A paper describes a structure:
ERα contains structurally conserved globular domains of the nuclear receptor superfamily, including a DNA‐binding domain (DBD) that is connected by a flexible hinge region to the ligand‐binding domain (LBD), as well as unstructured AB and F domains at its amino and carboxyl termini, respectively. The LBD contains a ligand‐dependent coactivator‐binding site called activation function‐2 (AF‐2). AF‐2 binds the signature LxxLL motif peptides of coactivators such as NCOA1/2/3 (also known as SRC‐1/2/3). In the canonical model of the ERα signaling pathway, E2‐bound ERα forms a homodimer that binds DNA at estrogen‐response elements (EREs), recruits NCOA1/2/3 (Metivier et al, 2003; Johnson & O'Malley, 2012), and activates the GREB1 gene, which is required for proliferation of ERα‐positive breast cancer cells (Ghosh et al, 2000; Rae et al, 2005; Deschenes et al, 2007; Liu et al, 2012; Srinivasan et al, 2013).
Direct modulators like tamoxifen drive AF‐1‐dependent cell‐specific activity by completely occluding AF‐2, but it is not known how indirect modulators produce cell‐specific ERα activity. Therefore, we examined another 50 LBD structures containing ligands in clusters 2 and 3. These structures demonstrated that cell‐specific activity derived from altering the shape of the AF‐2 surface without an extended side chain. Ligands in cluster 2 and cluster 3 showed conformational heterogeneity in parts of the scaffold that were directed toward multiple regions of the receptor including h3, h8, h11, h12, and/or the β‐sheets. To quantify this difference, we compared the distance between α‐carbons at h3 Thr347 and h11 Leu525 in the set of structures containing 2,5‐DTP analogs (n = 3) or A‐CD‐ring analogs (n = 5). We observed a difference of 0.4 Å that was significant (two‐tailed Student's t‐test, P = 0.002) due to the very tight clustering of the 2,5‐DTP‐induced LBD conformation.
Numbering used by the authors:
A (entry chain D), D (entry chain C): 687 to 696
B (entry chain B): 305 to 549
C (entry chain A): 305 to 461, 464 to 550
The structure:
């Protein structure tokens, strides 16, 4: 749910 | 994983192709610095640089083979080391100066604009001098930076249980490839066998000091966070909370 | 300059013979562990290890060639690193345990007695596991420990005498590199395996640096909370890192 | 002065 998580997938 | 089948030249090419861009600072237009002003610029730069680092990381061979959790862990652990080695690299040609950006070239004494930060500048500048004294090559730089990403957090890979062991072995295999790549570069440069080993040792030992600078930088940035000298981005706070809680 | 004139096998012998002894803890099984008492034991032990380290350092080839100012700085910078690699080394044969002393063998759940110390124990145990996985040899260990002494503080040194001292240190560091390689060659590693293992060992020093920095901060906070009385020696080593 | 400095002589 962390921002890092989002950018790793994006 | 088609990362372990790469040639030494293909490793270099991949890393060079993966290189992030040199971002600019908003430093406008040139008003006299303050403590809040410089912290603002530096951290703003860091946040923008972080977004690019994450996409660079995904282009480091072998990295995207790792689980989402492990990729997150590696970046959380190594993000400030990666920024700092990049800073040091583009500061090589400017002795006594830190090139945070083409329009943000800071002298040593400008680190005194922020409390306790000049000591961190001093360490970054010393590292830059060592790179310059070693005549560090660009192909060497991208190898060292990738090594930092894969190496820094692999020991803290908690859960030495089950398919996390497979992960750690994969990371070590890629690290060996990059090692081979560094040696290949030196062999190509005409270094003797003894010279190669010595230079390899010299470069990797610098990563010990880069770790040190990161740990100190993390502590300083945290102190600046708590004193609310500067508002940090949500992303920065997350990367910072990874070394705390 | 001596030291530089040493062969690899001469380098190895000097380091092996300079090895400090394994000390005992003042651990008293009469009383149960408290945060204060475990911090007391560990720091008492560190203090007594320091005195032996200081004398060990002087037997590391090239070290006594440096100024007193430079010897102090190197030791101030690397002391906790040097204690930790030794600890991790003698903990190799004890999976899931840290052999601080022959009478002081602690697992991670005993580290939980001190607030925030189990994180540091976890990192130490992982490194020990890493050394064990690599089948780290004694000769390799003493090379690595001397490398930590000469390297960790070399970057935090103007003048030309300061450059002469820096160059001298790197001369000796290159000598140990030659020594490590020669060891791996004698051990029968392939040319490729040699530089691969050299890299593996040196990359571990980055984690040891990390453990030291986390250790320094933890010890410092314990001090600022008056959990444990520290020797004047330890207070001065701790002070050398400023910290907060 | 400093103990370490003193110990490095003894
Ligand atoms: C603002 C800081 C100094 C500059 C630091 C920093 C910023 C951007 C970089 O590209 C970089 F390499 C770097 F090191 C980031 C933080 C760490 C300690 C201070 O609070
Ligand atoms: C008490 C500590 C844990 C044990 C630490 C310690 C003591 C003795 C050693 O031979 C050693 F290798 C070591 F690591 C010293 C400090 C650092 C962090 C904690 O405050």
């Amino acid at each position: 749910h962390k921002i890092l998580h989002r950018l790793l997938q994006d | 994983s088609l990362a372990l089948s790469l040639t030494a030249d293909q490793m270099v090419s991949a890393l060079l192709d993966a290189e992030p861009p040199i971002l600019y600072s908003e430093y406008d237009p040139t008003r006299p610095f303050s403590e809040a002003s410089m912290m603002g610029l530096l951290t703003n730069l860091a946040d923008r640089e972080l977004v690019h680092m994450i996409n660079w990381a995904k282009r480091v061979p072998g990295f995207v083979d790792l689980t989402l959790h492990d990729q997150v862990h590696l970046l959380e652990c190594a993000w400030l080391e990666i920024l700092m080695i990049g800073l040091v690299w583009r500061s090589m040609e400017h002795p006594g100066k830190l090139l945070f950006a083409p329009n943000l070239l800071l002298d040593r004494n400008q680190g005194k604009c922020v409390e306790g930060m000049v000591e961190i500048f001093d360490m970054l500048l010393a590292t830059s001098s060592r790179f310059r004294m070693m005549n560090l090559q660009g192909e060497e730089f991208v190898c060292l930076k990738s090594i930092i990403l894969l190496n820094s957090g692999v020991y803290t890979f908690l859960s030495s249980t089950l398919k996390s062991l497979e992960e750690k072995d994969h990371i070590h295999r890629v690290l060996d490839k990059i090692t081979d790549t560094l040696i290949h570069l030196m062999a190509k440069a005409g270094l003797t066998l003894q010279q190669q080993h010595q230079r390899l040792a010299q470069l990797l030992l610098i990563l010990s000091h880069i770790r040190h600078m990161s740990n100190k930088g993390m502590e300083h940035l945290y102190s600046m966070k708590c004193k609310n000298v500067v508002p940090l981005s949500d992303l920065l706070l997350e990367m910072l909370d990874a070394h705390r809680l």
